[model samples]
Each structure stands twice: as structure tokens, then as C-alpha cells.
Target: YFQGTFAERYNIVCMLGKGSFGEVLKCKDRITQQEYAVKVINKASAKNKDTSTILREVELLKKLDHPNIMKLFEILEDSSSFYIVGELYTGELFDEIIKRKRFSEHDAARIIKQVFSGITYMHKHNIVHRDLKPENILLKDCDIKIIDFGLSTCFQQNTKMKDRIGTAYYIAPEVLRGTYDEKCDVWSAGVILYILLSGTPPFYGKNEYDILKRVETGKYAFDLPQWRTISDDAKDLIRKMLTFHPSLRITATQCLEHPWIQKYS
Candidate 1:
């Protein structure tokens, strides 16, 4: 329904992409000529889950101010739709991983450090990002911004979440088994790091069941040629993050202070 003056204020420039939520359109501000992405969701036909999901994302993003966390400028609605507007990003971190071209140890450490920065802010605010995967990590001019907060939640530090929600490839073992804390995000970060360094996931199989089996086993190889050139310090951080026991896993602050991040970040 962004027609007439509404469209004139932020005219549709182009279609960026589309997902289950709705179509993301690139729009240009008429007054400032600034470009932004507006995710247009059809509210009339949206499932109850979909509307609630976007509202949560909007709510959490409104509280964030970190460079690595995505910015939500405003929300507009009409009789038939809801326009979720925000900073536009060029691509997903998933693209780089899909290229199967691993990053240098320095680049990998740098990216993860930025992610840690965002995660640290979220955890400090008592918010947990239930989904932390490359597809949700956007890149604008090579800088990172963690996005997609639909599955995230705000909770007390003493509370533990039992919901099993996340991309299967990056989901933590504890999440699969049914109870977890914020450390679940650390495990997802570790999985992302493993893929960044080695150009592959730390766990996998022919099907979801088999993949879950491998994750439950928590066994992953680090003997590839890709791992050879990477530093032991980087691997050390990954190991700490991927620890099976959530309590034993490294916290976002600890990760920020780790020797690897200290040197590379």
C-alpha cells in the first residue's frame, strides 16, 4: 500500500529479495535521496506466527545501538500490509562460505570478533539471539551486521530457554536436546567460525537425523589442509566455544578477551 505520497516519500527503487516473511524492496527517500530496504509484509494473509515474529524483531532491534547489530529505522502500515524498513545490506556472509573459499586466519578472526561484539551487547542486555547463522549475518561494503531477530528473545540471566529453534547446521547440541542458555549462541558462532576457517560445517550427514547425530556426538575433524595454516590460538577459541557443556563454553566477553581476538581483533 506504499502508493501515492507514501511512495513519493520513499519510492520503490527495486526488489532486493524475498523470503517467507515478505518481499524486501529497495526504496529511495525522496527528500534525502538516501536508499533503504523496506520489507513489505502482507498483514491480511500473514500467519499469526509470522506477524508476531516480525514484531519481536522490530522490538529487539529498536533497543540495539552496536555497529555490528542491524538498525531498524521505522515501521509503517496500511490496511493490507506492514512495511518494515531498515538499513539495506549488500549480501549475506553465507555467500562467502558457499564460495568454498576459506578466509585468511586474520579475516576470519576479525569477522568473528565483530560478531562477538554484537553478541556481547545482546547478552549484556539479557537478550538471546536464538538464530545465529551466516544467512542472518549481512555485509554492507564488507562490514558485518547481525540481522534476523525473529527467533530471538529477551530474558533474565537466571532464566534458561528450552525452545529448539535455529538452523540445524548451526544449532547447538544443548538446543537439540531441549534446554539451554545464551551459550547456545556461542555454539552457533563456533560453527560459523569453523566454516569460515575450513569452508565447511563442523557437523553434517545425509539427512537432518544424521546431522543431528553428528552434532550430538560432537566430533569434528580439524586435520584438513585448511586447518594447517590457521593458528592454534584461533582453534583454541573455537574449541572453547564449541564445548558440549554450555557452562564450560566460553562467554562472549571471554571470547573478546581471548588471545586470538586480542591479537587479531
Candidate 2:
């Protein structure tokens, strides 16, 4: 069900940012006075091609419930636009990584632990967050809030998803092969962990082809100076997460219990 009157319920404060579909706005609830980040999508612009993506994101967001995951409070729609109101988060992990260059082992462990917790919850609910890059992770007062579900999907146990849908650097080898399970998210999380500790992605290339080729090869190293200070426990977990075989790859639940994550907390 969609409500037609967004203006009557909330006071728009300012524009937060822009999405692929439309602009996100900061709005305050009229009754509770609580602020939220409202993603306003132009229905006409997304009429044919991108309509499913927007609707799917809303549907999946409504199904998810976790502190580390972005919460969807309500959906308001009119003839021309759709308003997706959710918890307000200010910064992305990508911005923080760029600003700090890299995080220390302790900090990285804490962040990844939270990420694993969120991923574990998602996987438990049969939802695979196909996109798990830093840019999709938001920071709300030091807590990790996973966002962006346009590419995520639900999968049955023992069956593989074959969409090959995900970003270049974080995409798993099994994904490029055209068949993969929820463990694909583990590979992406591993990429994030590697970047979190090293300030750079595990794989690199001049173009998308080169990047995907490297990802398919599943070859990455910690030979850089950044790795020297990183602990073996952390590296071990990353290796497990980024393993070539999806079946052998570490699960989010296992990652949460890894020594690196367990060490700090």
C-alpha cells in the first residue's frame, strides 16, 4: 500500500544526496519529530526499465530487520514519485576509508565484525547482499549499516544464483563463472576487509575487463607495506573469505567468530 501525502506527514529539511533513481532528502516526521533519510524516486523516469529495481529494493528492505542493516520505516507514493523513508545515516565507510587512508587492525576488526554480523543475519534469512562494497556500507555513530539492496536477492538452500550482478572489484570468482551461492557476499566482504586494512582493493586493472579477469583468477597478495603491520589472524580470515571456491569460502557467521574479530571484542 502507498500513501499519497508525504508532505502532510513529514517536513522536508534538505537534500541528503542523489541516487540512481532520484534524490534523497532529510525529512522530519511531523508527529514524532524524528528525522529520516527519504529516498525520493521519480516514477515516470523509472517507468519501464528501472522500476523493478526500485520496487525490489523497497520490498527487500521491508523484509530485513537488523540494527546493522538499514531499516525501512514506510513507503509513501503519489502519481509521479515514490518516497522511501528509512533510518538516517550521515557517512559511508568509503568516505571514511578515503579520509583515513586506512584503518588500524583494531578498527578494521571492529568494523568487519559488525559487517559479518549483518551479513550473517541476512544469510540466515536467505537474503544475499550481492553488493557488499564499502560504498554500500553506511556509518551511523560508529555502527555499520549495510545499504543498497537493488542487486540483492533471495536464494534457496543448496541452489546457486547465476545473475553475475555485482561491482568489479568485489565480485567473486564464482559470480564471474555464472553460478554462485550466498558465499559471494563473503568474497565481497573480504575485499572490503582487505581494503580496510590496506587502503586499496585486492585486485586492480586498467579497465573492467582486466579487473574482472583478475577477479576470476582470484589472485591477491598482502606484500605491500600496509600488510606488514596487519596481523596474521586478519590475513588468514581474508584468505578464507576470498577463497577461490565459494563452497570453501568462509561464511559470515564463521567470519564473526574468526580470531581477528574475536580478538578485539
Each model's backbone clash number: 0, 0
- Quantify all predictions' global Cα lDDT against the true fold: 0.76, 0.78
lDDT of 2 by residue, 18-94 (tens): 75336789999999999998888665545345565656656866877887888878777777787878888767888
Q: For residues 72-135, what per-residue lDDT tens digits would candidate 1 score against the true structure?
A: 7766666667676788877788887777478888888888899999899878977678778887
Highest-TM-score candidate: 2
Off by over 4 Å in 1: 1-11, 29-33, 42-57, 79-81, 140-142, 150-166
TM for every model, in the order presented, reads: 0.80, 0.82
Q: Top model by lDDT, which number?
A: 2
Which ten residues in a row are the worst by lDDT in model 1? 154-163
Instruction: Report the backbone clash tally of model 2.
Output: 0
RMSD (Å) of each candidate, 1 decimal: 5.8, 5.8
Estimate the lDDT of model 1.
0.76
Which whole-number lDDT from 0 to 100 does residue 175 have in model 2?
78
